[model samples]
Each structure stands twice: as C-alpha cells, then as structure tokens.
Target: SMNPPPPETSNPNKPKRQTNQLQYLLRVVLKTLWKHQFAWPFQQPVDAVKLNLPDYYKIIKTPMDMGTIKKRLENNYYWNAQECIQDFNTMFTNCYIYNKPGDDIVLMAEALEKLFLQKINELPTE
Candidate 1:
C-alpha cells in the first residue's frame, strides 16, 4: 500500500500561497466536472447528494503542481494543461462538435482522484 502525503500544516512564519485566477478557474472546472459529470463503470453518477465532503475537500485543498499536471498531460498524450487544453480547443474548432472539450476536463480530474482513492483504501473503509 502506498503512503499518504503528510497532512498540510499552516505556519505563521510562512504565509500560505493563495490561489490566483488561473488556479481558481482550473479548480472550478475540475470540481464542476466531477460534481456534475464524469462517470465510471459500476460507480453511480456523483451529484450533490452523492458528494463526499472529505474527498471533495481533499481535492480542493490540494495544489495542482505544474510538474504533476505536466505528468498528467504526458500520460494523456505522447506530447503534453495549457497545451492539452489548447489542443482540446483546437480539435473542437472544427465541424459540429456538440459538447465542448473543456467539459471533458473531468477525465484528468478523475485520473488524479483515482490516486487519492487508492491511497484512501489503504486505511479501513470505516
């Protein structure tokens, strides 16, 4: 089983980095994706009622480090969020695509969520 990262602690001596516009936007997109969309086999569709506070809180509180996002993009494409999101946009600029590719951001959100879920499982279910 894998170990969980150390819990984050706040220090008065070191000011915490506040999230900016881009990070805030990214968080909103990812959260909205998981909260309203994104489905996996056998897992019931998650909605307001199904939302788990711990899981949701964990995601929002966690930082999406550039290197990690780069790795996620690498895992998705042999090449590369900016580039990936840009490519998604470029792909949809063509003929008759109904759903916007931005809506598909859940795929990456799910990938990240999966890692945490696995880590959570290392402990007792209750």
Candidate 2:
C-alpha cells in the first residue's frame, strides 16, 4: 500500500472559493437562470406522459433539471462547486440527448449554457 503509483500528471490548480459562500454564489446563478427563458426548457423534468416524450427516461439515465438542482442546493447535497457545475452540465447534456441538433430547444440550451459559463467565470476565486 505504501509503494504508490509512479505516473505523474499536471498539477491542477483550478481556483476555488476559500470562503464557504458557494451556496450564496450558486443561488445567484439559480435565480438568474430562473429569470431567463433560455433556461426554461431545462427548468423542470420532461413529462414523459403529458409532454408526449415516452422514451425520455429510457434515454436519459441521469435526468438533471434546474428545479432538482435547486432542491439539492438547499439540502447541502453538494459540498464542492464542481458538483453543482456537473448538475448544470448534466442538464445541458440531457438536452442534447433528448433534443435533436438544430432544434429550437437545443438552441436555447446552447444560449443558456453560454450564459451559465460566462456567469460562472465571473465568480471570484474567493
């Protein structure tokens, strides 16, 4: 157990918020997304029965939506900001899977994703 692996990778020095304000920062993004129609498509889970998407669950193994992410955020379900990032990414990835390329909703996802990335970068590395 003491003879560790020998391979070395680049030291990842991604910035972090030293202060425990991730909840506050993440909430800001949540509210911003809520206000944008671009994010509305992914705001809630796809209603397989009502919206007429029968195979949604079959295709998207991990369904991520803004509402679900909000609940998780409040419960401290995520400690690392990366986890929150993953949820947002998951929401978009799911869109790509369910919505065909060039689709209007897909376009919204792209626009919303761009907004999400830009805002996330604006967060200070506290």
Candidate 3:
C-alpha cells in the first residue's frame, strides 16, 4: 500500500470568511457567478467606472454609482460586510429584473469584488 498520497490536505477547522448573512449571500452570489452565468441589461468595458444598473429594477429604487459603492465598502466600521452587501444587493437584483447578459454580470461582479474585498486582503502587515 503506497503512502496514500499524504492523506490529502484539508482545513477542517478553518474559520468562516463571512461575518453575517449578507456577506455570505454576496459570496454565494459571486461564487455562483463564477460557476454559472447571470444576465444583465447592458454591458460596459471592464475599466468603466459607471455601471448601468437602473433605478426601476433596484430594491432601493435607485441607480448604481461606483463612487457610492467604493465609499460604502471603505467604511468598514459603518457598514460592516453585511450592510455593504445589502447596498450592493439592490444593484444585483436589478440584473435579474432586466435579464442582462451573463457575461456582463460576471464582469461587474468581478470588478465589484476587487474594489470591495481585494484591497482589504492585500494590505501589508505593519
């Protein structure tokens, strides 16, 4: 019986990444996007700051603004991870309403994750 390939690696006690339901939901939504496709009404270049998530389809009945998104994500104490997802959920729901292209949704979601989560994880320790 050969060494059995070192018994395969695992993180059995690994802590949860999400602090609440909204963060978990957002993570699910993104991971779902990664494995599958969702639709969007319109498409924009990856570098485009303004996304066209319209007010009519939003939960808050407002349009999506990049500045607001970044601002909310930056306010760690004020928003926490869940509240940030709540704000973003409004924009994401709109994608379903208008039946936007899947690729477009994936593109925006990737950029959203980069703006919201990537920096927090990438900072150097003091």
Best by lDDT: 2
User: lDDT scores for all predictions?
Assistant: 0.32, 0.70, 0.38
lDDT of 1 by residue, 7-117 (tens): 222234533332332232235433332343332311222221253333432333322232333333323321222433342232223211222344554444444445434
TM-scores across all candidates? 0.22, 0.77, 0.32
Clashing pairs in 3: 38-102, 39-100, 40-100, 40-101, 41-100
lDDT of 3 by residue, 1-126 (tens): 111121111233533232443344334533333333322322211122243434333332344433344433333222245444554555555444444556665466555545545433432232
Select the stronger candidate by TM-score from 1 and 3. Answer: 3
Candidate 2 wrongly placed segments (more than 4 Å): 1-21
Among all windows of ten consecutive residues in candidate 3, which has the lowest summed lDDT? 1-10
Off by over 4 Å in 1: 1-19, 39-81, 87-126
lDDT of 3 at 59: 35
| Order of quality (lDDT) | 2, 3, 1
User: How close to the true structure is residue 78 of candidate 2, measured as C-alpha lDDT?
Assistant: 62
